[PDB]
Amino acid sequence: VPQELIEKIKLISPGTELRKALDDIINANFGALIFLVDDPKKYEDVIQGGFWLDTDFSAEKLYELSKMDGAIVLSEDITKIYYANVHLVPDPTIPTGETGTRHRTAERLAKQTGKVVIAVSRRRNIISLYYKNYKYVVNQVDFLISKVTQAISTLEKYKDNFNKLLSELEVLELENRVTLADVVRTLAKGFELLRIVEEIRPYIVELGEEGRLARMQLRELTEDVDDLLVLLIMDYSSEEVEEETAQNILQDFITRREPSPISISRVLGYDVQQAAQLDDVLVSARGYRLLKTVARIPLSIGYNVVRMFKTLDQISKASVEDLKKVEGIGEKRARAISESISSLKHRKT
Amino acid sequence: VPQELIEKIKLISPGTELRKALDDIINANFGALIFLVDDPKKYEDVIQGGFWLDTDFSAEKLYELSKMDGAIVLSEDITKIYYANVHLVPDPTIPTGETGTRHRTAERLAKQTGKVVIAVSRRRNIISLYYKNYKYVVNQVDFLISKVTQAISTLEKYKDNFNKLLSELEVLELENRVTLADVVRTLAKGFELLRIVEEIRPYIVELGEEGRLARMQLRELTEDVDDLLVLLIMDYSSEEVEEETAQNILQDFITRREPSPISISRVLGYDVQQAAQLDDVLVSARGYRLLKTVARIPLSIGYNVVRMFKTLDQISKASVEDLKKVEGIGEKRARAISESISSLKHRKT
Amino acid sequence: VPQELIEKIKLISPGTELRKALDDIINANFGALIFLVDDPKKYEDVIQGGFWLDTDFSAEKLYELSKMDGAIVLSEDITKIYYANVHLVPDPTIPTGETGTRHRTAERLAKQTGKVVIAVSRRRNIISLYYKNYKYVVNQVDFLISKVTQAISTLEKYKDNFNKLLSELEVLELENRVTLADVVRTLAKGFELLRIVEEIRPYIVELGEEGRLARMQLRELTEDVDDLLVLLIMDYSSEEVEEETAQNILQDFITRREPSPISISRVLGYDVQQAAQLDDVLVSARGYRLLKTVARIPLSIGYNVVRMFKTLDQISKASVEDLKKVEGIGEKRARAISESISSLKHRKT
Amino acid sequence: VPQELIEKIKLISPGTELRKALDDIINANFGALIFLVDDPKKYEDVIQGGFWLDTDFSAEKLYELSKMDGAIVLSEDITKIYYANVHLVPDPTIPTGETGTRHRTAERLAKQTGKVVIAVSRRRNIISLYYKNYKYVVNQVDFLISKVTQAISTLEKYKDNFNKLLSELEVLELENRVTLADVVRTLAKGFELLRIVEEIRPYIVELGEEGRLARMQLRELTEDVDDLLVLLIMDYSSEEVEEETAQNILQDFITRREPSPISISRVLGYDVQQAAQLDDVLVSARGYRLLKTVARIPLSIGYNVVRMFKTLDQISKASVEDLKKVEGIGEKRARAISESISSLKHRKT
Ligand SMILES: Nc1ncnc2c1ncn2[C@@H]1O[C@H](COP(=O)(O)OP(=O)(O)OP(=O)(O)O)C[C@H]1O
Ligand SMILES: Nc1ncnc2c1ncn2[C@@H]1O[C@H](COP(=O)(O)OP(=O)(O)OP(=O)(O)O)C[C@H]1O
Ligand SMILES: Nc1ncnc2c1ncn2[C@@H]1O[C@H](COP(=O)(O)OP(=O)(O)OP(=O)(O)O)C[C@H]1O
Ligand SMILES: Nc1ncnc2c1ncn2[C@@H]1O[C@H](COP(=O)(O)OP(=O)(O)OP(=O)(O)O)C[C@H]1O
């Protein structure tokens, strides 16, 4: 959905005064045909008849004018009502796929002028927005809230399985018993999860002001996932990988590529043909995830620990004296690495 | 619900253009009577009057034609509108249980021709689909979404109790303190759970495109349960059982047989009359569940470990050298069995 | 809500054919006035005019007859339609609190005959059931489903806090560090929980067939709670208490008495004036809860263990030989008591 | 929303008989204009024509009178209907922002008299309440229930993250490895959580009687949070802080101040410029949270333990003899402190 159209869709989002008027018009089964332009003079030839009003906008005024036939002309910022009861006369030779004089007029006019034209069906109670060559049909709020609500429920289900997967991976990681299968399974869930969020965004956008709580739920559910998936990729790819590379991998499996177990294993740099092979490939975490999330060591300084110790297994065997010999690790950070790794080993294994 | 009818029901599932038209017709309290045939000529004798249109289908065109009396004739793939305003004249001596000329016409016509006939009640806003001798009344989406939503909530409740049961069984299993009561209680919950999924399927099917999120939730909630129930049956039945036998047992208690504690105990091969006996029967897990799910040992090679060691208790006491003597266990799989069983014992008991 | 009335309310519960007809009547804003009697002859004097039909009942027939003025007379089992378009003439000197000739007629007639009379308001879309001296207004399903859904959500919240309370009490119980405050807090949550279930029952009953999933959720959420509360009462009351006594205590705090911390402490047999005292009273569990739920020892035989050992603390210190000396404890049950108590101590403390 | 207006809003809250009448009026698309006064005589000059009724109030009577034009005059306690079909004539020179004679009349009249005037739009089905200079538009219940339901869902999400944060802080606290970052992160979640509750209150208030379950859910979800946040503030602020000071801090970050990590750190008395510094500041809990919540030591006597031992770390190293030397600690409370701290250390670390 192009950005220029998304902006127009916001004009009639729940919570706007225009939307309140359109909902009132629908509730009384008036129809409407609304032309949005900034200079009525430029459009003098497609606007005929009716009444020149040049008055300030309000939902009640729009409502009252929709009792009459014809079309209503508004300023584009929805602050002025210019015309009511007009006859719109766009070029008849412009192709239209609509049935019905009001909807056909609406499409032809939107195409001809590059402006927004809103049609409200009198007895079907549908709001159709036309802009340039686009047609957006407006969903009612209950439909949107239903979709969004179901989507969040689904995310809860995915997030639960993701946490369960990850907590099992933690154990394996602390005991150095991790296979590629374990990692790829965890990454796949994270990707699928973030995918759901992606597909639900346009519903949440269209909710406008009524989608605030939805956004907060989405945020509490998923905010820390992407950080985690990136660190998992830095911990388990075939060879050393910049955070940026890892973020790119993430972006791709969200959007362009399908998170199949083989696909992920191969993008991770492992030469696997068939999925049952993943059970057989042994891997060790580099240690970035634990270093950043638990030892609170910045990634930049984390590169050094990993450069020197190679694996988390080796980091966990290091004394505090051994750790200080890393460029950027003093007694404070050395203690943090040391103590938090042992605390996790004691408590989790 | 026969498969041939299920296909017809899909024609008017949420998300189809036909359904959008029927919903628009309902919203304006037009009625409708729609005859679906592939060759209008074959049916020249039940179709009378009206207008021959032979035009391409669309929701708006269907809407507009439903403003007129009589019936509308569509091609079966819903790509052509053949007729509007026709008088349908099926054989009057065909039995009908309907009241009202439009619904009676609809049933008689469906029976006589073997085709689909849709009746939309003008003021009751009901969509009735007739096909051959079947009558499907269409549920509105909000009703379906409500059912499906409640059903998923119920499944969450069952799934929680199932996980709690199973985690307690794990402890008992690791300490070799399992009674038949413990197993049968766990199996019963799993069966009841999978049963709910079965009963909710036709609701999710009828949702068509609007049931995508529901399907994903059902899948995240239950996908791994059946695997688990099968492995539990292989672990605790009276004598050795093929995976296929176990899958059959599962299928039955989902569908044909009621998962009573005594029923399950007896199908599991234990001679029990009254339920309080189950507390007294001591059992040991063969070890398949832990071998496949935790040691990632394929069932085929699992048969061998179990053939040699009989119980999970014995498998847990085996050294890594002892395990290698099993046909299909090398140092890698022997270590995995060994290490994962001890890790679970350390952490869970 | 008296039982005789509850039975009448079931006649128009969601899922009944009568209810389907009433919903169709409401959807078209017909009104209705329906008299339910088993012998029309007995009532010949309150039934005037209209048409004698003596025909089989169906929703469509009822619908069609509600298009006409007056009242419809049905058999009480809703299998026969006796009359349509009748003028009901109950004794005018019977007091009525209703406004409107149809509702006033309905109440007076219900009172005079002891039968059911249903009034459906033509433009308010309300279903009023009158029986003897009762008036039940029917809730629409969406309203009921909303209440029930909210109630289950609330129960989830209570149940979570109950589990958290109880798991903390388990720790204290295994370490013999339990105060009366800890117990009373746990009991209070359980009582409040079971109370919610009580208040939501009439909503679930009125849902009829559409309340099946609700019932299953209520059952999965709460089924084991009452058993547990009873065992807690047997474990912590001032002196020894029969299971029946404990069940009675439970019943009371659900229904008749308000579960205040002081109230519960005193019904439990502890002489406490002010709530902060509860922090100071040390108590020990008798051991019944752990004996029945974990050792799977029947209450009858549990009385003996407790008679001999007094507290769970003492039971946990007993050898297996010491336990066998209890009437009803052999080597099997002695091992179960012994082993499960130590397993819990190892894992939970 | 001023308190005097909130009281007026309660008059038409779900569950009131007035609200039931207004809903019936809306369902039939009658309009209404209702004037609430205690002495009709005082208002003889703005009330013209119509019928003097001086009769008792009921929803059905109000309904029936709304079938006629004009306005209805009620007593302020909604027990009397004084007038129907009257012509209200407030001073025309009073400014109004409304369109439409009924709404304009309503606002002008409310302003002129200081009384409540309710307007019900005939075809838009909106209830507008005017009182003095205020205008409250009434939300329909389904809209409110939707908001409230979404808000509780959101709170569940926040509460889950809060518990997870706090349980991790517990571990760090028991091992004396707490940074300011850990605390501030936990406080921020608690503040955001309590904030959501604050913003949702007016929705729950407007639900009136239909918001009972919502209130119970809000209460089960959040009741113990504020106590906990206060104790965290007493445990981690720069220097010693009275409970009252801490409660004040809480109140502020709920309402007046935005819970940014730097803002909280500084109000806590730590001189931090940029957020990454918080990772580097080491802190120790004073011990109040554990003393009150786990040792059940009253705050007053807690001041003394902390005065003598300074940190929880030191309290955990104290013998039972050492503890008794605190003013207000006898053998009972000394044992409780001692034993519960070690039980937590054993089980959590
Ligand atoms: N060129 C036009 N200019 C201004 N108003 C128009 C124009 N064409 C149609 N309308 C307005 O639309 C109104 C309905 O016309 P109609 O033929 O029913 O179209 P429609 O596409 O079927 O719309 P509905 O779905 O019925 O609301 C009539 C008129 O007030
Ligand atoms: N044989 C028929 N062929 C074509 N159209 C028919 C036929 N019978 C009825 N209709 C159409 O149905 C319309 C309504 O007839 P009606 O007697 O009210 O039946 P119905 O079963 O009660 O349907 P409604 O529930 O009112 O919509 C009238 C006519 O336009
Ligand atoms: N004694 C009666 N016997 C049979 N039908 C009656 C009787 N009284 C009223 N009705 C039926 O009720 C219909 C509506 O009467 P009405 O005065 O509007 O009562 P009501 O209580 O206001 O009902 P509504 O709320 O309008 O449906 C008229 C008539 O068909
Ligand atoms: N001063 C008034 N006194 C009593 N009743 C009034 C008064 N002004 C309007 N009404 C009542 O309101 C009714 C509708 O008038 P109207 O001009 O449509 O106002 P409105 O603000 O548009 O209300 P609606 O939104 O249509 O319900 C007519 C009359 O019965």
Ligand SMILES: [Mn+2]
């Ligand atoms: Mn006209």
Ligand SMILES: [Mn+2]
């Ligand atoms: Mn993030």
Ligand SMILES: [Mn+2]
């Ligand atoms: Mn006709």
Ligand SMILES: [Mn+2]
């Ligand atoms: Mn499966």
Ligand SMILES: [Mn+2]
């Ligand atoms: Mn009449």
Ligand SMILES: [Mn+2]
């Ligand atoms: Mn029970």
Ligand SMILES: [Mn+2]
């Ligand atoms: Mn008039």
Ligand SMILES: [Mn+2]
């Ligand atoms: Mn509190």
